[PDB]
Amino acid sequence: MVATVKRTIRIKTQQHILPEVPPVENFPVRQWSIEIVLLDDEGKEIPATIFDKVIYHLHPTFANPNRTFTDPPFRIEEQGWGGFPLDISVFLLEKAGERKIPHDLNFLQESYEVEHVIQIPLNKPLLTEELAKSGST
Question: Where does this protein have coiled-coil stretches?
Answer without folding.
Answer: none
